[PDB]
Structure formats: structure tokens, C-alpha cells
């Protein structure tokens, strides 16, 4: 079943799926868990 | 009952039927009309067809809010609206082609940031900032200034720092492709190269001079000796060079614009210096033109595209 | 481990720190030495602004490193 600049089966696992999970924040329904990827650097 | 529109972004409007015997708060949660908090207010006849901002209280409004503003901060809307009630009353004079702000409410750092933003190439990521910027460039800058205060966690009347303001706004800009390569050379230890990306690739604290950064600055090496640090490669549309405020000569044609800070670490005032056909000193609504400029400078902005050193 | 902090007057401060210390923790140690409120403090490593919520490890700051303490401006 199918970033802020514009760039699975039913969060840690989607993060798992080069950028380590720890730098990834995922946003769905305007809430942190179309999903939104926010990056911490 | 009357019909009104609720919104988080003032782009996507949601038709609502409101019970005129209950406050906006009871029906919508926190509610604002043109910046005014109407949460504890009952609907008025003349509210028919009007647009109200609401704090997101469902999945639609939460997605719309995040897509527009790029924050989940539940205080953001309240802080933005509180700021907008003040910034709507400021004056935004055109000063030889740039939108400035007449002095009010300790706003000189905000006016300096606004003037700088119109002179450097920056793409904002949040639609809120892209949309408000275009209005601000046209002279309608109240929303942009209120957003800058909200994003930077600043209150109207709070004293502020241009470097800090630009840094917070650069976090919301597409600087992904900006890259800086530095080398530090110790005659004992050898050479260490560092690469910086994004916001860190366009900021420097310790010299105002882009040319000095290219030529080399002496820094301590942990071996106990002095090393030389120099810029190897810069790929960005601008750089911001900062230093603790100090007397500095700005030479026509050698920089884009600069922040002058007069006063002390308790209280100061910013002016904006820009290099056009001659030097301009913008002080809110006031403009002075001069062939030379010396003053206490703390930020200098330079245009860039791609720079590679000739140092081997 | 120990690091050096250079102040605006040219005074050098010596701190005892760990790689896992946040910038907030290093600012607390400067307030113990110098009494400067953390909210005024801006720490710089060879020209790079160090940010709250990051660690000295995040910036690869090692023993005998020199930081520069500058202060926030207060423009109105
Ligand atoms: Zn060395």
C-alpha cells in the first residue's frame, strides 16, 4: 500500500524504510507520530 | 443563527452555522476576527459572511495549519494574532524602493531584518511566509512582521537581535543546497577540512569581512599552537558575516547591506546600510545618502553564487 | 573533560564538561563562574553558532577546545 521544501503495510518501521530514524519527525493529520517529513540537524 | 467562515490560513474557508446564543469559544474554541480575540464574545449580526481564524480542533484544520505554517506549536496562532493587532497599526514607508517600518514599539531590529530580506535571494518554505513576503514587498507588511515575531518567539515591544531573527527565519528557508567548506591548517598537526550545509553554511560570528574569511583567520589549535582557518568553497546566494558591534568602514560596491547597532548590551538601536548607486542609511522612515559610511557594524551581507579558493 | 571559553573582554574561562552536555548545560556552568544569565549567552565555536538542544558531541568539540562567548543584542 502506497519534506517542507516539496521533495508500506498497516512509524518506527516507515522511518526504518540514509537519514537515520532519530533525525526524522513524521507528521500526519497536522500532528507528529500524505505524511510530512520534518528534519532535525 | 448566522453563517460565517472559519480558517487557519485565510486561504481555505470552512462554512459554519453558529448559534447566536453561545460564544465563539463554546462553538469553535479560540476564535479571532482580524486579530481581535472574540472567543468569549457572542455572534453579532454584522459578523454574517465574515472570516474567523480558529485554533485547529479537527484533522482538517490541523493538516491545513501545518501545511501553511510548518509548525505544530498550539500557541502560534494566538501569538501571531496578538502581534498582528499591533503590526496593523505600524506604517510601512517605501524608502527608495524598499519597504521599511516607521519606528514604533522597539521595532528597529525587525525593520532591519525586513529590509535585508528584500535584498538577499531566499525562498521561504512555509506558504504563510511566501504569501506575506510578497504582500510586504508591495508595502502591506503587517502580516509578514507579525509572522516574523511569531516564528522568532518575540512579543511586540521586546528588544531584539537581527542576527538571531535572520537565523530563525533561515530555518524556514530552502537552504538545503547551501554548502561551505573550510580548512584549518596547523604547521604541526596538518589540515582539517569541515563541510557545513544549510543555515550553518551561510552564517559566521567573529568577522564582518568576507575577504578576511577567504584570506584566513588565526584560531587556536588544540595542540597549543595557532592554526589558520580559511574558506575553501562557498555555494550559496548570500553570506551573513557578523561580529560583536565595532566601528567599521563600509565601502560602496563591496557588500550588499549591513546592520548598524548603536548603544550597549542592555539597549540599542539598529540602522540599515545598503550599497546602491551610493550608500544609503535607512533609519525606519528616514533615509540619508552618503559617499562613505563608518559606524558600529554588527552584520554584513554579501552576494554569492559559487566561490572556490585559489589557496593550495 | 575541560574546555576554554573566551569572553568579549579577552578573559579566558576554564570549564569541566562532558560530550553529552547540551549547550544549555555549558551556559549554566558559565553562570556559575561569571554570573551571566544563560538567556544572554551565545556560544560560538570557530565562527559557528552553537544551538540549544544540541550537545558538544553533536559539534565534535574535544578537550582543550576554545569557545567564544558573545551576548545577544537588544535593539529597539
Ligand atoms: Zn596543531
Author numbering:
A (entry chain C): 1 to 2, 7 to 11, 17 to 19, 23 to 29, 35 to 50, 66 to 73
B (entry chain A): 4 to 315
C (entry chain B): 1 to 76
Could you give the paper's own sentences about this structure?
The Papain-like protease (PLpro) is a domain of a multi-functional, non-structural protein 3 of coronaviruses. PLpro cleaves viral polyproteins and posttranslational conjugates with poly-ubiquitin and protective ISG15, composed of two ubiquitin-like (UBL) domains. PolyUb and ISG15 have common other structural features: ISG15 comprises two Ub-like (UBL) domains and mimics a head-to-tail linked di-ubiquitin (Ub2). While K48-linked Ub2 (K48-Ub2) and ISG15 are similar both in sequence and fold, the topologies of how the two domains are linked are distinct.
To reveal details of substrate recognition, we determined structures of non-covalent complexes of PLproCoV-2 (single C111S and double C111S, D286N proteolytically inactive mutants) with hISG15 and K48-Ub2. We have also determined the structure of the PLproCoV-2-C111S, D286N double-mutant:K48-Ub2 complex. In total, 41 of 76 distal-Ub residues were built using this electron density map. Occupancies for most residues were lower and determined based on R-factor values and inspection of Fo − Fc difference maps. We additionally interpreted the interface energetics for models of PLproCoV-2 in complex with Ub2 using two geometries of the distal Ub derived from the PLproCoV-1:Ub2 structure and our PLproCoV-2-C111S,D286N:Ub2 structure with a partial distal Ub. Our calculations of interface energetics also indicated that PLproCoV-2-F69A should have a larger effect on interactions with hISG15 compared to Ub2, including the orientation observed in the distal Ub from the partial model of our structure. Our structures revealed how the protease differentially recognizes hISG15 using both UBL domains, while K48-Ub2 is predominantly recognized using the proximal Ub.
